[PDB]
Design a protein around this ligand. Structure first.
Ligand SMILES: Nc1ncnc2c1ncn2[C@@H]1O[C@H](COP(=O)(O)OP(=O)(O)OP(=O)(O)O)[C@@H](O)[C@H]1O
Ligand SMILES: Nc1ncnc2c1ncn2[C@@H]1O[C@H](COP(=O)(O)OP(=O)(O)OP(=O)(O)O)[C@@H](O)[C@H]1O
Ligand SMILES: [Mn+2]
Ligand SMILES: [Mn+2]
Lengths: 298, 258, 258, 298
């Protein structure tokens, strides 16, 4: 840990603060997530245990790389590959601009690649949103913050309830369905996709019911025809206003026929019919996909 | 979501070989024995019941333990400290609500301190290089069960019952991969409850056959057979509960006809 | 001779597979490329010439370098530091008298300090986890050389010269085992100097046949043919030398007709 | 390192300071060979480099277990399996009684096996002597101290000029022969074998020429007949006193025909003729090996 020179404070979270640093020896810029543990308290936090253990299996060009874990008696340093911005700020600086379709498609392509990889190694991210997706100065985007992540089983079990930041939380979860899985991450990605296009959160609810209600208004209140089982779900109320399903082209106006399709499949109610990352890679939306390299602002 | 079943099955099959502990570790091990280890895993079964932990957490703790012991020599007086740290880790990793470290210090009744339990946790982490997402017998059983026609909860719980029994005894199960044991556990359960045998669709899936499973099946059978008079009895007494359909009460096949 | 010669060959054949670097690691390296790598290896050749290090040390240095760069992201600027440290280590492991650090710092001509070189040395040791006894084309060439009757020094220098030309070019060489390059390098020399080929003796030993060693041989022959116009030329220079019987000056076969 | 309680001190010298420690969490007792790096001068010692790389590549029950390597900025402690004592101490202890032949045959049996493993893995020990061989409370003896070991290549090149401890140094070394091999270790071991039986060093030279002469006085001065090429080596003098060979029963008295046979073969002038570890293992002398427990004072 002496071959690193701190360079600044990046983004603090749970375990501790995150510095920027450079390996004085090889020149490689990295991010150092630190943990002082809970020495005479909780001990190594479960988030860090799930994050380090799962993250050390996921080696992929589209998942931030945990380069090393530095163990000392009183501190644990997690050395990550350094990425400049997160989608959240990138879009913010895209004032006027708008992320051009080519980059949205590139980004969507990369995210599915990295997410399909996670699902193939029984890992649910459960926290996809633009803050957690980091981009670099070469046109790449990668999934980050696997603190909420968890290794799943086949078949799945009942996992922690209410996961995923609200706006990006899937309908399965809000209805308090017994089991959720991989489809939850696909919902978050459908929302980020609509968001990259419109530059605005798709379902910016303030409570779970507001969220369901925004969801229903845009895709219609699901019934037993569209989602066999909805009406018997824990948090499904027969009093729910039944909204007609909005014409998809009105959901994200700038999108073509293809992108509409992909999005409609990503935002599919029934989690069993909602498209897989793996299968989304082969959609016509991506037939022209390239790797536009964006100029960053830092 | 079957869309990932085989990538995951194939992934687990690959990782199970990387978490494989030194199959000959007890021999080289100085102060502890198989019997002591059997005493330890049984206790952990109790701890799992006490804190109502998941079975997967049980399996995970044991996996961690066998791996730790495969490279670290441990004193009989120091073995439960390892067991508690592995159980604690297994808990944080798998549980929605894991017990607080105070609960774990309590269950090793007056024995160890919490700084001790905490320092061992850090050491189990150092030895295991943070590789905690280990494939367990339960993870395979869980997939196999999907090849029942139709699903029989008694076969399921019995399969689980037997897979757990294999945890107690390092001799002979420390040489069988989880997937194999999960195959033996499943077949022997299916047979004991429905007369049916290792399904063809599982041969396609796993590639394992009744004949690939014989060695392990022979062992698992004797274990099921001698179960009532095994020094340890927590799993038997655990699988009496309605939660597991009281399958420990079921009578094992006198023969397998293989 | 009588016992270990095979054990050893066999052992090496086992390790060479464990000692392999990611064949396309350079594509994942953001600031460095195979060309810069070539520049680096050629410089190293010059360094060995300079301090008269054993050819085996050159081979070890490049080994450790590909393994390091396969795991660690490095900037063009620190690239030579990884080289100096890799050479440092190879010298300590291989030579009876390795140059002191002062000498290794001096060759970088004020580019780096003695502390950086020393700090990189520890880093290359951490990353490579102290595993420095890497098999090399040289080791295998050495055994193969025994199976040549009569022993033609020119064939030896030529073989040495050929498998050394391979160290420079990650593409395509990085995808062959040392044993194979040793073979292709051997046959190509025997033929180029004495119109003969890969001996059955050697075939019974290695299990290599002129057609299993064909892909490599095909590349090795091109590399050989274009040696004159490769940007890197220290190996040609070093091999015009008298103790290498100007093998570089030799004329490579226009064809092989394999 | 905070997990080890430093208990005693043992072989401190050259580099090591070798302490006897116990892991405060497992209770395991290790032998810590601390090594001092030259952070601003020489860096990590070649001794440590070769020793660690080769030891962690030699897994056998008659080669000491290197358990871990603790990698700090300024220090480097080798964590080995603690074995009760070296053969040099057990031997001194055995003064007055002698190591029982059945235990001897056993010890030499185990050494030849470990050595055979080193040799079959192209590794030369080059410092075989009682002090560098360790034993345990059960009847096992292991090769230790690889600080002088080197990985060899076939055929052998020209390795480091005169290595090995004088008393156990083989003639080729002494005579400045051009290359050396696995046979230098066979000699050393041979000398050790006699030393165990006669309870005294076979050739206690007080110099290279004294050493040469003690060897000659015993085995007889070698000629071109017994060692085709002696006369032609860099340190051979035509002015060598031509001594006559002594009856082996004079040499190692307690030894029987096989013992004298196996020994005469581990002490062959011509290295090319000197028995191998693999062969010696076969040797009749061993026909009835067991695994006696030594009466320790441990
Ligand atoms: N690898 C990294 N590269 C660049 N910046 C990083 C990296 N890791 C963390 N950061 C910055 O810190 C902010 C917080 O994000 P991250 O989710 O990675 O970890 P954290 O918040 O420190 O901890 P936790 O995982 O508990 O949330 C991010 O928005 C990110 O910009
Ligand atoms: N496993 C061990 N158990 C007990 N003592 C050991 C062990 N390994 C080494 N030692 C002690 O240190 C002594 C020295 O051999 P070791 O290789 O440790 O060298 P050192 O003295 O540090 O350096 P050198 O290489 O110069 O001998 C042994 O003779 C023994 O007394
Ligand atoms: Mn975050
Ligand atoms: Mn010593």
């Amino acid at each position: 840990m002496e071959n690193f020179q701190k360079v600044e404070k990046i983004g603090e979270g749970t375990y501790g603060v995150v510095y920027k640093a450079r390996n004085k020896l090889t020149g490689e810029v990295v991010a150092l997530k630190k943990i002082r543990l809970d020495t005479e308290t909780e001990g190594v936090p479960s988030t860090a245990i799930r994050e380090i253990s799962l993250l050390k299996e996921l080696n992929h060009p589209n998942i931030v790389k945990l380069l090393d874990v530095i163990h000392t008696e009183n501190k644990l340093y997690l050395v990550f590959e350094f990425l400049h911005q997160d989608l959240k700020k990138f879009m913010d600086a895209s004032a006027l601009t708008g992320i051009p379709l080519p980059l949205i498609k590139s980004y969507l392509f990369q995210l599915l690649q990295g997410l399909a990889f996670c699902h193939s190694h029984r890992v649910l991210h459960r926290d996809l949103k633009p803050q957690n997706l980091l981009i670099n100065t070469e046109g790449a985007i990668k999934l980050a913050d696997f603190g909420l992540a968890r290794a799943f089983g086949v078949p799945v079990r009942t996992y922690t309830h209410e996961v995923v930041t609200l706006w990006y939380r899937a309908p399965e979860i809000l209805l308090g369905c017994k089991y959720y899985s991989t489809a939850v991450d696909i919902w978050s990605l459908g929302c980020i996709f609509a968001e990259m296009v419109t530059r605005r959160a798709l379902f910016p609810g303030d409570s779970e019911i507001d969220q369901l209600f925004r969801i229903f208004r845009t895709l219609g209140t699901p019934d037993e025809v569209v989602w066999p089982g909805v009406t018997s779900m824990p948090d499904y109320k027969p009093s729910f206003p039944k909204w007609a399903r909005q014409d998809f082209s009105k959901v994200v106006p700038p999108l073509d026929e293809d992108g509409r399709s992909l999005l409609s499949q990503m935002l599919h109610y029934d989690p069993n019919k909602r498209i897989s990352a793996k299968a989304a890679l082969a959609h016509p939306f991506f037939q022209d996909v390239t790797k536009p390299v964006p100029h960053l602002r830092l | 979501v079957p869309d990932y079943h085989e990538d995951i099955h194939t992934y687990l099959r690959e990782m199970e070989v990387k978490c494989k502990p030194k199959v000959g570790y007890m021999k080289k091990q100085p102060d502890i024995t198989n019997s002591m280890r059997a005493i330890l895993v049984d206790w952990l079964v109790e701890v799992g019941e006490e804190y109502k932990l998941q079975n997967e957490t049980l399996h995970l703790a044991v996996n961690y333990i066998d791996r730790f012991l495969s490279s670290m020599s441990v004193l009989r007086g120091k073995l439960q400290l390892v067991g508690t740290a592995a159980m604690l880790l297994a808990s944080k990793f798998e549980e929605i609500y894991p017990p607080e470290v105070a609960e774990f210090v309590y269950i090793t009744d007056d024995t160890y301190t919490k700084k001790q339990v905490l320092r061992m946790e850090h050491l189990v982490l150092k030895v295991l290089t943070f590789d905690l997402a280990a494939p367990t017998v339960n993870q395979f059983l869980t997939q196999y069960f999907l090849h029942q026609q139709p699903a029989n909860c008694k076969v399921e719980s019995l399969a689980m019952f037997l897979g757990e029994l294999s945890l107690i005894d390092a001799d002979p199960y420390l040489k069988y991969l989880p997937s194999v044991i999960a195959g033996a556990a499943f077949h022997l359960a299916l047979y004991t409850v429905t007369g049916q045998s290792w399904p063809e669709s599982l041969i396609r899936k796993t590639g394992y056959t009744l004949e690939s499973l014989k060695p392990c099946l022979m062992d698992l059978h004797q274990t099921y057979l001698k179960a009532p008079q095994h020094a340890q009895q927590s799993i038997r007494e655990k699988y009496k509960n309605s939660k597991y359909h009281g399958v420990s009460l079921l009578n094992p096949p006198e023969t397998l006809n293989l």
